[PDB]
Design an enzyme around this catalytic site. Structure first.
Site, mmCIF file in Angstrom:
data_model
loop_
_atom_site.group_PDB
_atom_site.id
_atom_site.type_symbol
_atom_site.label_atom_id
_atom_site.label_comp_id
_atom_site.label_asym_id
_atom_site.label_seq_id
_atom_site.Cartn_x
_atom_site.Cartn_y
_atom_site.Cartn_z
ATOM 1 N N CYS B 111 0.803 -1.227 0.000
ATOM 2 C CA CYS B 111 0.000 0.000 0.000
ATOM 3 C C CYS B 111 0.839 1.282 0.000
ATOM 4 C CB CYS B 111 -0.927 0.031 1.220
ATOM 5 S SG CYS B 111 -1.878 1.559 1.339
ATOM 6 N N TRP B 283 -9.173 6.284 -0.371
ATOM 7 C CA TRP B 283 -9.496 7.053 -1.569
ATOM 8 C C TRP B 283 -8.549 6.661 -2.720
ATOM 9 C CZ3 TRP B 283 -8.311 9.970 3.017
ATOM 10 C CH2 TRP B 283 -6.983 10.414 3.099
HETATM 11 C C1 HEM Z 1 -6.342 6.503 2.367
HETATM 12 C C2 HEM Z 1 -5.920 6.460 1.098
HETATM 13 C C3 HEM Z 1 -5.332 5.177 0.446
HETATM 14 C C4 HEM Z 1 -4.627 5.186 -0.693
HETATM 15 C C5 HEM Z 1 -4.274 6.431 -1.547
HETATM 16 C C6 HEM Z 1 -4.237 3.823 -1.008
HETATM 17 C C7 HEM Z 1 -3.495 3.424 -2.102
HETATM 18 C C8 HEM Z 1 -3.320 2.109 -2.469
HETATM 19 C C9 HEM Z 1 -2.984 1.640 -3.799
HETATM 20 C C10 HEM Z 1 -2.773 2.555 -5.018
HETATM 21 C C11 HEM Z 1 -2.905 0.306 -3.752
HETATM 22 C C12 HEM Z 1 -2.605 -0.631 -4.933
HETATM 23 C C13 HEM Z 1 -3.975 -1.197 -5.332
HETATM 24 C C14 HEM Z 1 -3.891 -2.047 -6.580
HETATM 25 O O1 HEM Z 1 -2.991 -1.776 -7.419
HETATM 26 O O2 HEM Z 1 -4.726 -2.991 -6.734
HETATM 27 C C15 HEM Z 1 -3.194 -0.121 -2.385
HETATM 28 C C16 HEM Z 1 -3.190 -1.414 -1.912
HETATM 29 C C17 HEM Z 1 -3.503 -1.829 -0.634
HETATM 30 N N1 HEM Z 1 -3.978 -1.028 0.404
HETATM 31 FE FE1 HEM Z 1 -3.967 1.107 0.365
HETATM 32 N N2 HEM Z 1 -4.721 2.992 -0.020
HETATM 33 C C18 HEM Z 1 -5.409 3.790 0.901
HETATM 34 C C19 HEM Z 1 -6.057 3.314 2.023
HETATM 35 C C20 HEM Z 1 -5.941 2.045 2.570
HETATM 36 C C21 HEM Z 1 -6.572 1.578 3.790
HETATM 37 C C22 HEM Z 1 -7.540 2.449 4.642
HETATM 38 C C23 HEM Z 1 -6.201 0.294 3.984
HETATM 39 C C24 HEM Z 1 -6.556 -0.687 5.130
HETATM 40 C C25 HEM Z 1 -7.038 -0.291 6.328
HETATM 41 C C26 HEM Z 1 -5.314 -0.074 2.897
HETATM 42 C C27 HEM Z 1 -4.694 -1.294 2.740
HETATM 43 C C28 HEM Z 1 -4.210 -1.786 1.553
HETATM 44 C C29 HEM Z 1 -3.842 -3.165 1.299
HETATM 45 C C30 HEM Z 1 -3.896 -4.385 2.242
HETATM 46 C C31 HEM Z 1 -3.379 -3.190 -0.147
HETATM 47 C C32 HEM Z 1 -2.899 -4.445 -0.896
HETATM 48 C C33 HEM Z 1 -4.122 -4.921 -1.676
HETATM 49 C C34 HEM Z 1 -3.879 -6.195 -2.443
HETATM 50 O O3 HEM Z 1 -2.891 -6.929 -2.149
HETATM 51 O O4 HEM Z 1 -4.702 -6.462 -3.366
HETATM 52 N N3 HEM Z 1 -5.171 1.012 2.057
HETATM 53 N N4 HEM Z 1 -3.448 1.009 -1.635
HETATM 54 C C1 BYV Z 2 -4.809 -7.994 -8.206
HETATM 55 N N1 BYV Z 2 -5.697 -6.821 -8.175
HETATM 56 C C2 BYV Z 2 -7.091 -7.264 -8.345
HETATM 57 C C3 BYV Z 2 -8.016 -6.056 -8.240
HETATM 58 C C4 BYV Z 2 -8.065 -5.471 -6.830
HETATM 59 C C5 BYV Z 2 -8.690 -4.099 -6.888
HETATM 60 C C6 BYV Z 2 -9.443 -3.760 -8.007
HETATM 61 C C7 BYV Z 2 -10.026 -2.491 -8.092
HETATM 62 C C8 BYV Z 2 -10.728 -2.196 -9.134
HETATM 63 N N2 BYV Z 2 -11.337 -1.899 -10.076
HETATM 64 C C9 BYV Z 2 -9.844 -1.582 -7.061
HETATM 65 C C10 BYV Z 2 -9.086 -1.911 -5.940
HETATM 66 C C11 BYV Z 2 -8.897 -0.901 -4.820
HETATM 67 C C12 BYV Z 2 -7.506 -0.983 -4.177
HETATM 68 C C13 BYV Z 2 -7.455 0.185 -3.216
HETATM 69 C C14 BYV Z 2 -7.831 0.031 -1.891
HETATM 70 C C15 BYV Z 2 -7.808 1.132 -1.045
HETATM 71 C C16 BYV Z 2 -8.212 0.952 0.396
HETATM 72 C C17 BYV Z 2 -7.395 2.369 -1.523
HETATM 73 C C18 BYV Z 2 -7.036 2.480 -2.864
HETATM 74 N N3 BYV Z 2 -6.640 3.668 -3.393
HETATM 75 N N4 BYV Z 2 -7.078 1.398 -3.662
HETATM 76 C C19 BYV Z 2 -8.508 -3.173 -5.856
#
Ligand code: HEM
Ligand code: BYV
Ligand code: HEM
Ligand code: BYV
Ligand code: H4B
Ligand code: H4B
Ligand code: ZN
Lengths: 409, 413
Positions: B111, B283
């Site tokens: 993240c 967001w």
């Molecule tokens: C608040 C603004 C946030 C931003 C800008 C943000 C941004 C991102 C981005 C860009 C990704 C990559 C997603 C993808 O490519 O599929 C990601 C993944 C992730 N985020 Fe954050 N996120 C936010 C909030 C959170 C919150 C609130 C949580 C948990 C409490 C969180 C937990 C995670 C986790 C566990 C992943 C890995 C997801 C996966 O393995 O599919 N994020 N986040």
């Molecule tokens: C291997 N990836 C499979 C898809 C997972 C995923 C797909 C979408 C979409 N559309 C959107 C998300 C949201 C991921 C995310 C989660 C949070 C909490 C914040 C943020 N900026 N982005 C995840």
């Protein structure tokens, strides 16, 4: 175990068995991954099993494992190490080794070309003038009037560590970099230190933005000596844009020949500390890294000006817009001058095909996703979606210390 | 393992020193002979497995509140062990639940948005017993997090796993997603990524509008029962029409996206306890929508259509027509969200913030696990500071984990 790698866009799954052949470390452990670390982490007794391993895979590669030639070669190498604390590769083995070091280079996206490599044997070289001659011939051959050909020149192997052949330049062809009184930098900031060593050694600098550096060549452990590459051997490309007629006025140019000269080639326990090798450029190497890296030529802002972009907020993506136009210009310029260059879309495509070939014929292909994915437009290229396994196979190209940190004058 | 690992930034030459990696609790998938850094994904706890996991967590919690070794620390340890002994599980205090959720985020190496980790609204839904109750909790989550466009990061946590046959699951991978419909001619309508889930919803009774941007219903499973369908009230679903500041024709592509990214298929693990339904939301970073959702070949795949309307030469890849359209698409996404005052962050701002976050964590915590492959944005990588930043990846707990899809494991009653 057999390992599967999947492409998440095509859903193609490949099975890797080749990784079982590796014996060297990656740097990671079960609990810590160092996949994004740039630089993670002889004697007769170490030397023979390594030599044997290499002889074994060479003879296995020509379908004559355990043959009479094979048995004889092993014996010969054994005696030679005994008597001399080293051994000499046969010509066929040298060429096989060099091609396979390229083949095994996990960080190289250009490996579909691996079996087309002109190998220049420079193992009879004894002096810096000799090295210069061999390097000029290499540059002339590889440049080929724009029709670039991949080549490697191999200088004598390490013996005692005090008689090393080294090309002190990190590449054969590079632009000087100058530290200005006002504290800014003229030319390439990456080469400021090397440029200073050349000046300190007698090189008279023109002090321009694109001054080709002299060669600094160390033969048999001696002090390095300076040589100017004859300019007609140095192919350059003025950068212009097919739409922006003001782009030519930026005064940008680059050289056509990418030629790494600071790596170590390892083959069967033997170390070749000077092995300059060259191919042709992928457009992003110049357009993204050389020109747009903050720590390099750093031209984004100027280009963004000329494009009259709104540059007050990052969210206008003015940097991204300028970055694309610069890379269009590089590709266009090289193509218009009939100088070999590949765009990142074409290169990554070929790499995927290469991976598929290698999985079929070899059982895998070691690949470093961090380096393979291009530094722009990543996910619109096919490698972004390709899982890759990284592992170390020998023969190999390895990093080595800068010569000015381990040399006594 | 060496006590001190160094990471370098190749742009700034800044060197940081990691000691936090010593607390690593689970496998990366790599070995000393192979690195699996680009691999996407590389019956309950027994009393004896649970004891040391709970203690490790409780110690960490009391250390965090500067009460390590206190009477309250020792009492809590004894109470927890007593519960595990009598019941084969234990219950977290609300304070510990909140601490664990924030730390699971803080620890999420994939993240980029973690600078915000200590600001997370945690909703305790552990008293929930039915799918209808789950729905109420999810609606309240969506309304709170959306906040009319001023988005607030939030997590809602449903009851932990017991024997594994009574799991709470949100079957949706995200709370808000668009339907995908496979056609008899082989084409896809809507979001090709969601075809399988969409077919499941249809089978469960959902009448599909069969449009390009149909919000999927919630499929909610409570206490291991068969999942039930609920329509999210449309007024709770904030959406943004995509237009471009320069190209008047862009709005005519008819694109839009939802404002709230809310992951609902991950498992939250705290002190050995497993929360199989823990939807969380933040967001968007613009590239998530503009590069991945719109430009992936396996998604909406609009590069060609945008390219044609841009009058670009598309016969040679070397024209970089794809890269050019990609940038304009991402400009439009950011411009549309900012205009409608829905929170969004561009990839330059986010990666710059992440570097600052990472440097602060190395300072105060001894490190910051990060997955470079995921942190570097899917466009313009090297013009962001993260590209040049070496990162160490390791798994700390509390953590968010992947879990199998519920339709692959569910025992239909
Ligand atoms: C608040 C603004 C946030 C931003 C800008 C943000 C941004 C991102 C981005 C860009 C990704 C990559 C997603 C993808 O490519 O599929 C990601 C993944 C992730 N985020 Fe954050 N996120 C936010 C909030 C959170 C919150 C609130 C949580 C948990 C409490 C969180 C937990 C995670 C986790 C566990 C992943 C890995 C997801 C996966 O393995 O599919 N994020 N986040
Ligand atoms: C291997 N990836 C499979 C898809 C997972 C995923 C797909 C979408 C979409 N559309 C959107 C998300 C949201 C991921 C995310 C989660 C949070 C909490 C914040 C943020 N900026 N982005 C995840
Ligand atoms: C023929 C066309 C070639 C193309 C298009 C190509 C492409 C590339 C690119 C883009 C990189 C990344 C460079 C960087 O970011 O610094 C790279 C690295 C590398 N290449 Fe290739 N290459 C070619 C030829 C070769 C040849 C002929 C060899 C050896 C005989 C070779 C061996 C390597 C090695 C060892 C690296 C890693 C360099 C490092 O770790 O710093 N390449 N290549
Ligand atoms: C950590 N990086 C340190 C600098 C190494 C390097 C710098 C430049 C430049 N400028 C250019 C290159 C060329 C790399 C290369 C080598 C070959 C053989 C082909 C090709 N297309 N590109 C390498
Ligand atoms: C920190 C990170 O490993 C470093 O910036 C790498 C990233 N990927 C790269 N990829 C290529 N091709 N060349 C590079 O120099 C780098 N640098
Ligand atoms: C094969 C590779 O690991 C895969 O395509 C990854 C690359 N990096 C990513 N990074 C983010 N943020 N999200 C992703 O889905 C992916 N996909
Ligand atoms: Zn690894």
């Amino acid at each position: 175990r057999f390992l599967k790698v999947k492409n998440w866009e095509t859903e193609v799954v490949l099975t890797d068995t080749l990784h079982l052949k590796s014996t060297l470390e990656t740097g990671c452990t079960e609990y810590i991954c160092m996949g994004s670390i740039m630089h993670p982490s002889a004697t007769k007794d170490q030397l023979f099993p390594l030599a044997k391993e290499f002889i074994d895979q060479y003879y296995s590669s020509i379908k004559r494992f355990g043959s009479k030639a094979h048995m004889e070669r092993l014996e010969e190498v054994n005696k030679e190490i005994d008597t001399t604390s080293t051994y000499q590769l046969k010509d066929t083995e040298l060429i096989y080794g060099a091609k396979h070091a390229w083949r095994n280079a996990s960080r190289c996206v250009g490996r579909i070309q691996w079996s087309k490599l002109q190998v220049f044997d420079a193992r009879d070289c004894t002096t810096a003038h000799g090295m210069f001659n061999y390097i000029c011939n290499h540059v002339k051959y590889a440049t080929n009037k724009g029709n670039l050909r991949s080549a490697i020149t191999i200088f004598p192997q390490r013996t005692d560590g005090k008689h090393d052949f080294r090309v002190w330049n990190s590449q054969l062809i590079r632009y000087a970099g100058y530290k200005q009184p006002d504290g800014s930098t003229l030319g390439d900031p990456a080469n400021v230190q090397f440029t200073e060593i050349c000046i300190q050694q007698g090189w008279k600098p023109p002090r321009g933005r694109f001054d080709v550096l002299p060669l600094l060549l160390q033969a048999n452990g001696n002090d390095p000596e300076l040589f100017q590459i004859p300019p007609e051997l140095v192919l350059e490309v003025p950068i212009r844009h097919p739409k922006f007629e003001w782009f030519k006025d930026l005064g940008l140019k680059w050289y056509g020949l990418p030629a790494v000269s600071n790596m170590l080639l390892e083959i069967g326990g033997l170390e070749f500390s000077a092995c300059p090798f060259s191919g042709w450029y992928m457009g992003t190497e110049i357009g993204v890294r050389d020109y747009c890296d903050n720590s390099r030529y750093n031209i984004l802002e100027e280009v963004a000006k000329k494009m009259n972009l709104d540059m007050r907020k990052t969210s206008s993506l003015w940097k991204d817009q300028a970055l694309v136009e610069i890379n269009i210009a590089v590709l266009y310029s090289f193509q218009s001058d009939k100088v070999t260059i590949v765009d990142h879309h074409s290169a990554t495509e070929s790499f995927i095909k290469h991976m598929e070939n290698e999985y079929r014929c070899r059982g895998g292909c070691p690949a470093d996703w961090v380096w393979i994915v291009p530094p722009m437009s990543g996910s619109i290229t096919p490698v972004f979606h390709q899982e890759m396994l990284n592992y170390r196979l020998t023969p190999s190209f390895e990093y080595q210390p800068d010569p000015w940190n381990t040399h006594v004058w």
